[PDB]
Write a protein that binds this DNA or RNA. Structure first.
Lengths: 324, 96, 147, 49, 136, 177
RNA sequence: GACCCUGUUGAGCUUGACUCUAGUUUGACAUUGUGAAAAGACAUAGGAGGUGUAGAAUAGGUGGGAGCUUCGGCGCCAGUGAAAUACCACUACUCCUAUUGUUUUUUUACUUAUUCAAUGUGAAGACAUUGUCAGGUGGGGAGUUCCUUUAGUCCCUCGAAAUUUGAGGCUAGAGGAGAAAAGUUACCACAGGGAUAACUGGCUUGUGGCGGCCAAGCGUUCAUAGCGACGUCGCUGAUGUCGGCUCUUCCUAUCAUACCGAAGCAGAAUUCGGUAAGCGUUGGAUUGUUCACCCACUAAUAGGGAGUGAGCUGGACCGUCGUGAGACAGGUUA
């Protein structure tokens, strides 16, 4: 029976009763067992080529000579590479120290790919702590325009500042603000990118602590902050800009209450926002009605990512367009 | 910087002058090679900034962020010595 | 605890070498430029570039420790747990920054295998432990959890 | 212009470019017709005069 | 001490045998244009390393060696000997139908038995290397 | 955040003149009309656009962390020290250039001074204590420093001798991670 | 060498009041009209709608429920599912058609808004500029001397949520003369000062440390203020200025030769221990070195000493120019 399978997964993998109930519910039982296998397997390590300094094959050919095995990550990205084996450490490579690449995750590539930051715009990154997102924004923007990268912490802002200088970005303003404070204090952005803090259910191999330390209290606290975070993204963006005024909502969670209900909340609290096609090549459509909680029918454009369908962390990209 | 501008000037100049400029750029490719090979390859184009044609400094035009396309308009120029000039110039582009 | 570890398995250059390479780029030096730290240390990450103010203090690789024998006062068990960070050396403040392991030094250990259920039903992952031996004299680190 | 993949030995999208694209699409071609109809409007007015 | 061995220990390679092979490659270039490499006595982390650098990467690198040396990654290294016919058939199953373009052998016998026993054991191992080289 | 004063900008441009040539290129209006300016935030000089610096006013003083490209810091004694975060600006208009081999690039990134055996290419007519920018053989900028001797003097050097004192190398990014 | 301190320097941390405001910047509105092409939100009259999993099925949802009946098909009892189907009452949205309409915005058109120039009307153009509010910042200018934590009331608002939460308030303790500079560090560099002016000598050897249990005793009277042994339980190829050679004598911490005790010690070969210094105790290979292993000869190829053993063999002071950093056929000296 399912309750027996529930208790077996809770004991074999070390999952909590609350979290494993949630994860078994959203997958069918064959799809569930593939998900729990992929969670305990580390993802492949990937590299994002800095367009501002080099291009991909010249970086690829250079790392061949130092003793690194590479292969590009699919046809979806013209920039990323996948590392299989390496003698030289990746962080000590002279090409790395010159700013030719940054160690990232493949799931981190998607929200900057879903948004389309063009030249001479003003962009906001509402959680830019490691810096992989923001330096991707500037590479697409060719070191033009302004990027407002903010953090809520001083400590992880220091690593972001070093990544900006190492990759040679020079079009960023690093500030230490809460995300809710931002529309009041600056406002009027052509594009905003929101990587909201979440449970980290999509990232299990990197963070095994969330396997047990996530309860019913935690899943009331986090979607409430993310709902206020998403409404701040709307008020930051301007409805009528010369280029597109677009918003991207991104999270590394798999749980439905953290990604699909918050985008339904934003579509019901601001009528002047519309869901648009993400433009991502691969993915799975968002859930329209889950367990008696019907959503807006436009949620089908939203895409989801899983570690067993592809070697990509559990992800969720929602792209918005502002009207009025 | 000069390779892009000499290609531009060869478009709007008399027949003998255009043939001479293509001869000059032919010598630059043979002598320098890898230094200016990335201009005709659009995949090696830099993304540091954008190309400024109207610049008052040699350094500030950012010449490596543009691509040369005047060879499309000059394989069609009425003088075949201009046409022969490209086919000699693109020959050493492939010879690098 | 060993059985879960067995089931889970079934599922750069040194600071000493770096100091040698930099010395080739220099000349006649001050006598005793390097200050080798004799006391056993914990460093954490494999390769870091230290500040200039700490670059002389060489901690050799054969004098390092990553795991500690940690005893739980209430469960009455001893398990080998990884060391996360050195928090307080009560002898020298510089030893705290250098990571020197000394009797009475508080370290932070990973208690994920011990399965401590805290308040609000969360498995503990980092706890204070006081080193209760002299790792200079014996080749191990012994600690008692501050639980 | 920014998407084409010109190479010294691979010219495929370069040859195509805007083959399936009309004469009138460019803003040069859009506005020059406006004088072309203005030329015949002028040619009719002197003919009427 | 050896200046080439000291250069290897500083930056170069595991041993000075890699410096020997690049001197042979500098004398005559054959590793640049070949495709299949077979070493009958793989030097530890030195001969396979220069084979990994100059040649195209991961293209049929056979590392048979009787001495149990450390397995070099991206090089198909075998710890079995070479004189037995069973190891020859194991080599055959691993190369499929692609015979070796370049064959290498390191003669390291137990030198010390009055230089005559060692010279013949070196020469007998060299002829056994010629037998497998003439086979493939 | 405030702009530099007369005394501070003399010291900043004196350090830049040691390493670069076209200093008027830095203070020059581009196509859009905006200029590159100098801003000071917490004893640190930032080389940033004026348009960027104008819309960064709305960030609070305690709540602003970085702006564009950081050149370096002004110390307590009033001196200005250049950091490796200024290297893309230095490499754009470098006066004197030194190239190191692959066996000399890795010691430089660890923190060593350039030795004679490490050099792969010099710049002719270089004075004794001048500001040089260090590249590898692939024209990748690695750092900057001060030459020890003249180029003519260092051609005769014993190949364990110092030819350039290291001041900043791009291994400093590994320090702040 | 190393330890302590002072001065200068570097690296790092902290402080640098409050109120308006120049500058800079965000949002909303206004000038200001007349036409053309569209979009959205408000307005209806209609038409059509809902595939996560499992369920026979593609379950908007809510309330009654137990045949109006052309079918007794279909409801009821049966699952499976948060939710169950016959039948009639409700609005909540999504996709289309049309007109009996409001406003806001985009593109475009024309000058009356607006701007520039001239004197005793020409040009631009519904975009700028400008004006008023609401904000952000303000190391600049002018005047005067806010939040966090703690403990209580469960006394009050906003946001979310399938009935549970997050963000603030009240009481009074603690944290954060003023752009000149100041405070601070078992950290660094340089220069200087202080203290010590090398150390060990009835030294050393075969049996780890931590924690719990047990524990004869002792203690401030004694199995408890506490200290507390033996046990038991729980956790756990090095190397590389190092080597080689050296007569004689001594030590035993004995490899061999002598003699004993014990062992499934059948014999043979041995293993472990005891008394024993009388007598003996090599050479190869091994990246170059020591070895550890591996080989041959041999009865065997033991280890050490002659107060930190003993012999042959394979530098530190000023001066100049700097210092983000060294150089000097410069001087002097043991």
């Amino acid at each position: 029976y399912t309750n027996q399978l529930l208790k077996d997964i809770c004991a074999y993998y070390g999952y909590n009763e609350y979290l494993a109930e949630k994860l078994l519910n959203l997958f069918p039982p064959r799809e569930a067992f593939a998900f729990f296998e992929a969670n305990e397997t580390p993802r492949p390590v990937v590299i994002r080529t800095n367009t501002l300094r080099t291009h991909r094959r010249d970086l690829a050919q250079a790392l061949i000579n130092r003793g690194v095995t590479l292969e590009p990550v699919g046809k979806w990205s013209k920039v990323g590479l996948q590392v299989f084996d390496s003698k030289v450490p990746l962080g000590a490579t002279p090409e790395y120290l010159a700013g030719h690449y940054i160690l990232q995750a493949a799931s981190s590539f998607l929200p900057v790919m879903a948004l389309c930051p063009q030249e001479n715009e003003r962009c906001l990154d509402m959680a830019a702590a490691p810096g992989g997102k923001t330096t991707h924004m500037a590479a697409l923007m060719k070191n033009t325009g302004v990027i407002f990268a903010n953090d809520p912490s001083k400590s992880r802002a220091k690593g972001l500042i070093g990544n900006i200088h190492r990759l040679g970005v020079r079009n960023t303003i690093v500030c230490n603000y809460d995300a809710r404070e931002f529309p009041r204090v600056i406002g009027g952005f052509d594009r905003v990118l929101l990587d909201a803090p979440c449970s980290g259910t999509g990232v299990i191999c990197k963070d095994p602590s969330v396997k047990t330390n996530r309860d019913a209290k935690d899943f009331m606290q986090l979607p409430h902050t993310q709902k206020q975070l998403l409404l701040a993204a709307i008020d930051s963006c301007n409805h009528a800009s010369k280029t597109g005024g677009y918003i991207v909502y991104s999270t590394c969670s798999v749980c439905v209450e953290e990604n699909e209900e918050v985008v339904n909340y934003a579509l019901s609290r601001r009528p002047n926002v519309k869901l648009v096609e993400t433009g991502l090549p691969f993915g799975k459509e968002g859930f329209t009605s889950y367990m008696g909680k019907t959503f807006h029918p436009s949620l089908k454009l939203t895409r989801r990512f899983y570690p067993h369908l592809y070697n990509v962390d559990g992800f969720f990209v929602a792209k918005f367009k502002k009207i009025g | 910087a000069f390779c892009k501008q000499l290609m531009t000037l060869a478009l709007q100049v008399p027949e003998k002058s255009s043939q001479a400029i293509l001869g000059l750029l032919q010598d630059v490719v043979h002598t320098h090679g890898r230094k200016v090979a990335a201009l005709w390859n659009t995949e090696e184009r830099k993304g540091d900034g954008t190309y400024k044609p109207l610049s008052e400094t040699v350094e500030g035009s950012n010449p490596f962020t543009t691509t040369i396309w005047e060879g499309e308009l000059l394989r069609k120029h009425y003088c075949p010595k201009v046409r022969e000039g490209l086919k000699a110039m693109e020959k050493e582009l492939r010879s690098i | 605890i060993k059985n879960k570890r067995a089931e889970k398995a079934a599922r750069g250059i040194s600071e000493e070498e770096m100091f040698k390479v930099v010395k080739t780029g220099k000349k006649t030096h001050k006598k005793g430029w390097k200050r080798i730290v004799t006391k056993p240390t914990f460093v954490g990450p494999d390769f870091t570039r230290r500040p200039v103010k700490y670059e002389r203090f060489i901690r050799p690789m054969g004098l390092r420790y990553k795991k500690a024998n940690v005893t739980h006062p209430t469960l009455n068990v001893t398990v080998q747990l990884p060391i996360l960070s050195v928090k307080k050396n009560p002898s020298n403040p510089l030893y705290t920054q250098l990571g020197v392991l000394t009797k009475g030094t508080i370290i932070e250990v990973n208690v994920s295998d011990l399965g401590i259920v805290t308040a609000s039903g969360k498995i503990a992952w980092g706890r204070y432990a006081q080193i209760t031996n002299n790792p200079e004299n014996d080749g191990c680190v012994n600690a008692v959890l501050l639980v | 212009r920014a998407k084409v993949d010109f190479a010294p030995k691979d010219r495929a999208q370069v040859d195509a470019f805007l083959k399936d694209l009309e004469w009138e699409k460019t803003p040069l071609g859009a506005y020059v017709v406006a004088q072309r109809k203005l030329r015949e409007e002028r040619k009719r007015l002197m003919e009427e005069a | 001490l050896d200046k080439w061995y000291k250069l290897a220990k500083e930056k170069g390679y595991r041993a000075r045998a890699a410096f020997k092979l690049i001197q042979l490659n500098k004398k005559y270039g054959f590793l640049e244009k070949a495709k299949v490499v077979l070493d009958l006595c793989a030097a530890p982390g030195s001969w396979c390393q220069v084979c990994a650098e100059t040649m195209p990467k991961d293209s049929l690198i056979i590392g048979v060696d009787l001495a149990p040396i450390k397995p070099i990654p991206k090089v198909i290294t075998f710890q079995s000997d070479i004189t037995t016919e069973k190891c020859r058939a194991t080599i055959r199953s691993h190369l499929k139908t692609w015979k070796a373009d370049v064959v290498l052998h390191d003669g390291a016998p137990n030198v010390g038995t009055a230089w005559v026993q060692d010279s013949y054991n070196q020469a007998e191992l060299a002829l056994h290397s010629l037998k497998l080289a003439t086979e493939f | 955040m405030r702009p530099l004063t007369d005394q501070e900008m003399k010291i900043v441009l004196d350090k830049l003149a040691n390493y670069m040539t076209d200093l008027k290129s830095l203070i020059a209006p581009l196509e859009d009309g905006d200029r590159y300016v100098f801003r000071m935030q917490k004893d640190r000089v930032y080389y940033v656009k004026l348009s960027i610096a104008n819309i960064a006013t709305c960030v609070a003083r305690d709540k602003l962390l970085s702006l564009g490209t950081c050149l370096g810091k002004m110390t307590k004694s009033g001196k200005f020290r250049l950091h490796i975060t200024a290297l893309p600006i230095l490499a754009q208009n470098a006066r004197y250039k030194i190239w190191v081999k692959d066996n000399g690039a890795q010691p430089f990134l660890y923190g060593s001074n350039i030795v004679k055996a490490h050099v792969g290419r010099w710049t002719e007519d270089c004075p004794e204590h001048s500001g040089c920018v260090v590249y590898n053989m692939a024209d990748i900028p690695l750092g900057f420093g001060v030459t020890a001797r003249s180029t003519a003097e260092a051609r005769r050097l014993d190949p364990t001798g110092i030819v350039c004192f290291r001041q900043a190398d791009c291994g400093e990014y590994l320090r702040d991670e």
